[PDB]
Structure formats: structure tokens, C-alpha cells
Amino acid sequence: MTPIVHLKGDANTLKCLRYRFKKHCTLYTAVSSTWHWTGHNVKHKSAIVTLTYDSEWQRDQFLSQVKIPKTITVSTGFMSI
Amino acid sequence: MTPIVHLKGDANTLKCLRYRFKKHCTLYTAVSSTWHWTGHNVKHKSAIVTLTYDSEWQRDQFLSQVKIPKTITVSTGFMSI
């Protein structure tokens, strides 16, 4: 299936990460625009993004090229399309 | 795991669907803001959204309360967080 990572944290701390993916253009398959769980009642800035990898092995590579702050939690799963 | 549906199509045709989810507030677990696969070279308006359900059974219910145009393709998968 297609691997999909999910990172979250301060909407601002996410702006800096996107830049790191610029030099790592040869590591992910498709970057999604910044989005979040919208709802009638929100809380604060917690924008979230997602990155699809062509394989799990390549996934560990990106995590080795970018440092995931301890405040940002990662996610693991797979989709079918 | 957590079920996750993925719909796509004309960014405009998606605006009408979001309204249907308003009356079906008791059917999904978390609606995500409108987003899409951003990239240096885009094509046209193809915004995409996602909906998480608490179970597969409840998933078939939402699909029965909203008509998915033949131009919009659905998706099936699961995440782990």
C-alpha cells in the first residue's frame, strides 16, 4: 500500500519544516498542502500536513534527513487508491 | 484502525458536499479542511477533503445519506495513531 506520515504541532513550526523538504525533493512522492481538523469550535494554531512515500525504506531516510522536534508527533499508516 | 475516506473532483463541486455533512454531523468523527496535492507545477482546481469514521459500518451510512457524483472517486484505507 502507500505509506503516509502525519506530523502535527505549532502551525509556525511547520513553516520551517516545509523548507527542509525543498532540498529533499528526491525523498517523498507527494506533499499535501497545509490543512487541519476544522470544526465549529476550534482551539488554536495546530495546522497539520502529510507526506506520501513510495516505500517504507525510503520513509526512514526522510526521517534521517529532517529532525522532528520532540513536540511534533509522527504517524504511521497506509491508504488504498 | 481508523477508517478514512478520500473524495476528489471539481473544487467547486466539493463546496456543495460540505453542506450535506452539516445535517449529517452525527455520522463522521472528524472532518478535515479542504486541501490538495500542492507542487511546483499544478494543473487546475482539484481540491480534496477527507472524513474519518468510527467504524466501517457507519461509513456505509454516510455514503447512503450523500450522493457521490460519478465524477468524484472515493477511497478506502486505514491509519494508525
From Swiss-Prot, chains A, B:
Phosphorylated. Sumoylation plays a regulatory role in E2 transcriptional activity. Coiled coil: none annotated. GO terms for molecular function: DNA binding; DNA-binding transcription factor activity; nucleotide binding. It is found in: Host nucleus. GO terms for biological process: DNA replication; DNA-templated transcription; regulation of DNA replication; viral DNA genome replication. One of its GO terms (cellular component) is host cell nucleus. Keywords: Activator, DNA replication, DNA-binding, Early protein, Host nucleus, Isopeptide bond, Phosphoprotein, Repressor, Transcription, Transcription regulation, Ubl conjugation. It comes from the Viruses. Residues 2-81 are annotated as: DNA-binding domain. There is a cross-link at residue 8 (Glycyl lysine isopeptide (Lys-Gly) (interchain with G-Cter in SUMO)). Its main location: host cell. Binds DNA as homodimer. Interacts with protein E1; this interaction greatly increases E1 DNA-binding activity. Interacts with protein L1; this interaction enhances E2-dependent replication and transcription activation. Interacts with protein L2; this interaction inhibits E2 transcriptional activity but not DNA replication function E2. Interacts with protein E7; this interaction inhibits E7 oncogenic activity. Interacts with host TAF1; this interaction modulates E2-dependent transcriptional regulation. Interacts with host BRD4; this interaction mediates E2 transcriptional activation function. Belongs to the papillomaviridae E2 protein family. Plays a role in the initiation of viral DNA replication. A dimer of E2 interacts with a dimer of E1 in order to improve specificity of E1 DNA binding activity. Once the complex recognizes and binds DNA at specific sites, the E2 dimer is removed from DNA. E2 also regulates viral transcription through binding to the E2RE response element (5'-ACCNNNNNNGGT-3') present in multiple copies in the regulatory regions of the viral genome. Activates or represses transcription depending on E2RE's position with regards to proximal promoter elements including the TATA-box. HPV16, in comparison to HPV types 6 and 11, is more often associated with malignant genital cancers in humans. Part of the antigens expressed and presented within HPV-positive head and neck tumors. This is Regulatory protein E2. It comes from Human papillomavirus type 16. The lineage of its organism: Viruses, Monodnaviria, Shotokuvirae, Cossaviricota, Papovaviricetes. The chain holds residues 286 to 365 of 365 of the full protein.
